[PDB]
Design a protein around this ligand. Structure first.
Ligand SMILES: C=CCN(Cc1ccccc1C(=O)NC(c1ccc(OC)cc1)c1ccc(OC)cc1)Cc1ccc2c(c1C(=O)O)OCO2
Ligand SMILES: C=CCN(Cc1ccccc1C(=O)NC(c1ccc(OC)cc1)c1ccc(OC)cc1)Cc1ccc2c(c1C(=O)O)OCO2
Lengths: 150, 150
């Protein structure tokens, strides 16, 4: 669906990269935080849902599913908070391969900035613009614009 | 044009809110920083252009236009950096009205969070979702989707 996103948390350089993936398109937003907490996850989802029409979030683990602070942000922003269980088994693999691709890109730009957060945003840019043909950034806009026309 | 954005810097609580407005739709992204510097503005433009197809940015003042860090980020991300001179005088008033409206919304949410950055992101969400009839978040997706189908 146009409104469905998946949370994903990966580690690099002793830091955490929190990723939101729009499942239908593969488009992503990401940020670097010192560690995953409910307050950091809640703030990231509030940012995401002010930028895209976020209807459902599959959370990345049971601590973020349970967290009262995350539940409060999902309430505030009108998001249905769901678990992230790969009922479809091809979902573990899909996230795994995105983390590996992101980390590959980060390493390809890593010497172009001191701080990891800059490299991660260069990787977000390269990921979203990569043509596979349409890019993920093209796909998400097409999907949502098609939705709005209904 | 679908790719034209304008930077805007406003102050509150001794902090700076940097805003990027997509001119054709009124859609915005914003962040709080302790002060405007070339490095903060460059990082913010890198974030923006990994999320939307940013072709041109009208910078908010001549220091950000001149800044080599900002010029480096615009080169990296494929952005044409422009001045932000209101050759059309209505532009002045439009940005001022947007600052005033943002600050009004921030005041309306201010007690719902300790940190100003949370209130600013609540204000971004309310601004982008407000119907004027379409919202700014609907307008930007439809403008860009129409562009992609050319
Ligand atoms: C004085 C700037 C500080 N720093 C210097 C630095 C430190 C180490 C290595 C490189 C650099 C460097 O100069 N890279 C260029 C660059 C130039 C040519 C290239 O050609 C292939 C590629 C990249 C650059 C310019 C603007 C950018 O803006 C998006 C990002 C990167 C860059 C920086 C800016 C803003 C930030 C940062 C950082 C950071 O280092 O992380 O962190 C948060 O905001
Ligand atoms: C223990 C949490 C810390 N803090 C407590 C606090 C401190 C002061 C005032 C209120 C609160 C409060 O509990 N607000 C609820 C709330 C509950 C009911 C409502 O009904 C109208 C409206 C808002 C809230 C929950 C999750 C949110 O997530 C988007 C935002 C806000 C909220 C917070 C979280 C994450 C952050 C923050 C902050 C912050 O204070 O700025 O800053 C960066 O990431």
């Amino acid at each position: 669906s146009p409104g469905i996103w998946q949370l994903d948390c990966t580690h690099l350089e002793g830091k955490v990269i929190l990723v939101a993936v729009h499942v239908a398109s593969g488009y992503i937003e990401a940020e670097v935080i010192p560690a995953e907490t409910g307050q950091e996850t809640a703030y990231f989802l509030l940012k995401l849902a002010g930028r895209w029409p976020v209807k459902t979030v599959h959370t990345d683990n049971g601590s973020n599913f349970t967290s009262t602070t995350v539940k409060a942000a999902c309430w505030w922003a009108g998001i249905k908070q769901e678990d992230g269980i790969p009922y479809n088994p091809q979902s573990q693999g899909v996230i795994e391969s995105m983390n590996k691709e992101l980390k590959k890109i980060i390493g390809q730009v890593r010497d172009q900035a001191e701080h990891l957060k800059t490299a991660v945003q260069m990787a977000v840019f390269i990921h979203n613009h990569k043509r596979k043909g349409y890019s993920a950034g093209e796909r998400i806009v097409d999907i949502i614009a098609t939705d709005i026309q209904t």
